[PDB]
Amino acid sequence: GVQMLLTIVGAFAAFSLMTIAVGTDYWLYSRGVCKTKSVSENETSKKNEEVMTHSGLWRTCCLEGNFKGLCKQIDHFPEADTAEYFLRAVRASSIFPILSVILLFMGGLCIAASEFYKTRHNIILSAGIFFVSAGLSNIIGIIVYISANAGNSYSYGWSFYFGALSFIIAEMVGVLAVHMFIDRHKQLRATARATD
């Protein structure tokens, strides 16, 4: 009653925190430019001025100057081998951060479906795997994001700390989901033994 309740809250929190992180472009605070700069030097004099930036996974934007509130798409394939092409493809596609969102959503359905098919018990286990698997996918996404950015000061933003915080909540839910699967079978075996 109080353990199932925490699982639902944790699942909703972790899913909400991760989708916000994917959808909000405040992952990193560094220096950069927003305009395409490749404007065939129409103005020329208006050369790229390095300004404080708040980049994300899909779009960058400017935090100060005359270009404030102007955004841009992040070019992950600029103008070689098998170690700097697949890594950029993973970073550009952001498969793992998106995959973590999907797994958290799938785990939530199993928890939601665990109040209709109460007799079935493997549904609760399936949710535990999704929440644990989602946490492992969030680790890869963070590692890839940091590794790609190494390709001079910076400071990670709140959006970056929302995905990291999602990993902890997701892992906690996984433990709570497995513990429900363990408790269920223990009760089911205890009753069966008593009848025997």
Residues 88-107 that bind ligand PLM (CB under 6 A): 90, 103
**The only residue of 132, 134, 142, 169 in contact with another protein, by rule CB under 8 A:** 132
Residues 20-39 that bind another protein (CB under 8 A): none
Q: Interacting stretch for ligand PLM, rule CB under 6 A, among 56-64, 120-128, 158-166, 174-182?
A: 120-128
**The only residue of 27, 130, 131, 162 in contact with ligand PLM, by rule CB under 6 A:** 130
Residue 52: closest CA among 153, 162, 159: 153
Residue placing its CB nearer to ligand PLM in the complex, 4 or 87: 87
Residue placing its CB nearer to ligand PLM in the complex, 32 or 107: 107
**The only residue of 20, 51, 71, 87 in contact with ligand PLM, by rule CB under 6 A:** 87
Write the secondary structure of the chain as one string of H (helix), E (strand) and C (coil): CCHHHHHHHHHHHHHHHHHHHHHCCCCEEEEECCCCCCCCCCCCCCCCCCEEEEECCCEEEECCCCCCCCEEECCCCCCCCCCCCHHHHHHHHCHHHHHHHHHHHHHHHHHHHCCCCCCCCHHHHHHHHHHHHHHHHHHHHHHHHHHHHCCCCCEECHHHHHHHHHHHHHHHHHHHHHHHHHHHHHHHHHHHHHHC
Residue placing its CB nearer to ligand PLM in the complex, 92 or 125: 125
Q: Which does 92 bind (CB under 5 to 8 A by kind): another protein, ligand PLM, none?
A: none
Closest CB to ligand PLM belongs to which residue? 87
Residue placing its CB nearer to ligand PLM in the complex, 68 or 118: 118
Contact at 8 Å (CB) between 163 and 28?
Answer: no
Q: Which does 51 bind (CB under 5 to 8 A by kind): another protein, ligand PLM, none?
A: none
> Can you read off the two tokens belonging to residue 89?
């493809």
Interface residues with ligand PLM (CB under 6 A)?
Answer: 83, 86-87, 90, 103, 122, 125-126, 129-130, 133, 140
